[PDB]
Design an enzyme around this catalytic site. Sequence first.
Site, PDB file in Angstrom:
ATOM      1  N   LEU D  43       0.827  -1.193   0.000  1.00  0.00           N
ATOM      2  CA  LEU D  43       0.000   0.000   0.000  1.00  0.00           C
ATOM      3  C   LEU D  43       0.866   1.250   0.000  1.00  0.00           C
ATOM      4  O   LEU D  43       1.948   1.285   0.590  1.00  0.00           O
ATOM      5  CB  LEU D  43      -0.921   0.011   1.208  1.00  0.00           C
ATOM      6  CG  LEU D  43      -1.760  -1.258   1.369  1.00  0.00           C
ATOM      7  CD1 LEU D  43      -2.499  -1.277   2.678  1.00  0.00           C
ATOM      8  CD2 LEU D  43      -2.688  -1.394   0.224  1.00  0.00           C
ATOM      9  N   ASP D  44       0.353   2.288  -0.646  1.00  0.00           N
ATOM     10  CA  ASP D  44       1.025   3.572  -0.677  1.00  0.00           C
ATOM     11  C   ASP D  44       1.037   4.171   0.723  1.00  0.00           C
ATOM     12  O   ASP D  44       0.581   3.567   1.699  1.00  0.00           O
ATOM     13  CB  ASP D  44       0.331   4.504  -1.670  1.00  0.00           C
ATOM     14  CG  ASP D  44       1.255   5.563  -2.224  1.00  0.00           C
ATOM     15  OD1 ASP D  44       2.276   5.846  -1.566  1.00  0.00           O
ATOM     16  OD2 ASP D  44       0.956   6.121  -3.301  1.00  0.00           O
TER      17      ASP D  44
END
Lengths: 50, 82, 92, 88, 62, 108
Positions: D43-44
């Site tokens: 995930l960012d």
Amino acid sequence: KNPYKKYDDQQDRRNLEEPLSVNDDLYDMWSPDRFTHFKNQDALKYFIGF
Amino acid sequence: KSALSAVLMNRFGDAFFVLGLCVIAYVFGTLNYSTIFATAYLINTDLLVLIMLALFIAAMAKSAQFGLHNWLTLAMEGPTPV
Amino acid sequence: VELKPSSAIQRGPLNKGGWDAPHALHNDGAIDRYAHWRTFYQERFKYTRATGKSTLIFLVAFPALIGYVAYQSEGLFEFAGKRRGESVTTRG
Amino acid sequence: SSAHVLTKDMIQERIVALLESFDKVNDAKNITATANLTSDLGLDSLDVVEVVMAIEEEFGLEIPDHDADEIKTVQQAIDYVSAQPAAV
Amino acid sequence: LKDYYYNGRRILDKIPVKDKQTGKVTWEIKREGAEKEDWVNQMYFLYAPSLILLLIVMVYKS
Amino acid sequence: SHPVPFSAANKKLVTSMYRQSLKLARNWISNRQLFRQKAVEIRHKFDQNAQISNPRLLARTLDETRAHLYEFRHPDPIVPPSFPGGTKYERNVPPRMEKIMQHNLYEP
Ligand SMILES: CCCCCCCCCCCCCCCCCC(=O)OC[C@H](COP(=O)(O)OCCN)OC(=O)CCCCCCCCCCCCCCCCC
Ligand SMILES: CCCCCCCCCCCCO[C@H]1O[C@H](CO)[C@@H](O[C@H]2O[C@@H](CO)[C@H](O)[C@H](O)[C@@H]2O)[C@H](O)[C@H]1O
């Protein structure tokens, strides 16, 4: 003041040995509520203009 | 704090209400509805104006018209049945 | 003779005799200073351009205005039982 | 009336479901109590923010920054939601 | 005796009660009675009744 | 000033701005579809400028976000009832269980 921080006196948002201003009775939680949205001059303009 | 606001608007109206009571009793010499209403058609309009303005200012506080509706929305901080 | 107090006086400490109770307050050190200051403000008060404003307002202008109101309205109003058309004043 | 209580297993079931509905996850069956957000699930540094906003709406909370940025793990989020008596 | 009685009453939170038959008193917890203050017999029986007499008299002088 | 484009402090900052923007959308908008639309548009507006490297233009952009967030402030934010700005915060506080300290030697 940030409510999410842990103060000793969580209700009044004051730590124990926090220094007090000379006019702290105005600047505590029992004092009249501040409003942070409108600055008060524009508020007076809007109220009287309405 | 909402409780303090409500009861201090109350006294801001009650002060004028006592001013009206003091005037009613200076003028008619009594406070009861029977005498005051059997005579009010004879007494100077300026006096009834002073009386009713004060009683109305008290009613403006309690009845929460625009000048003194502050307390009413704050009074919701209590329980719903209240 | 060496001038010293009489040796017949037997002296001792002052015991007021109170029962020293437990600590039911936690002193805070800053609140106490704020109170010392707000209590002895009088010994540091100085005259300046705001103190002078408040002082002359509340001790010259407002008293003088209230007195002008009184000594004009002294025996003016008298309206017990008055009626329509009748004046409420005793003067013009 | 409101005869309802929360449990560590129930919080875990709801959090993994919240993450299974998330399209920007790597893929399912990586999600577990030991799952990291930036390394495992991939995930960012804004999807972690969106996930925390999602946990708030799910369990009815308000998580500030100094408690949010330290969430870098799902079990951490579980222990957090277990450390709010009003976790709904 | 005053000092000992009261320091023990505070610290131990007991009073000494010799029961009927055994001649041996010790500290005990029972405090629901048997303890009276030195100011009661004066006030409740000389002040208060006089205040009530004052009320009656003001009423019947009215 | 030196607001570095690829460090933890800027990460904290931009994450906070993103949280704040989302909450502002959720408070301003009533319906849910439009909330998701605005959320996606904001994530796009962020990913578009996640790539900058000059600290100057970065800091100018952060100032523009600050002005925007100040310009769409909400005066009555949604907050949970049992949390500080709510209707049920310190309603029934369990009193701290304390023992009776004594003050006098004769009185209770
Ligand atoms: C400058 C000198 C004045 C001398 C004359 C006296 C003038 C009137 C009294 C004003 C003096 C200042 C009063 C300061 C008291 C403040 C006490 C306090 O700390 O409590 C604050 C309280 C409001 O509490 P708050 O913090 O707002 O909580 C809300 C959040 N739930 O505060 C309150 O609730 C307010 C209580 C006062 C209410 C007064 C309302 C007046 C409104 C008048 C509007 C005009 C109506 C027209 C009247 C007709 C007259 C002819
Ligand atoms: C902020 C501090 C500075 C301000 C201090 C203010 C204190 C007051 C000082 C001003 C005093 C002026 O006082 C003034 O009043 C008297 C009457 O009252 C005036 O004198 C007047 O007295 C009356 C009798 O009452 C005479 O009949 C006559 O008509 C005369 O005009 C004077 O012209 C003057 O003495």
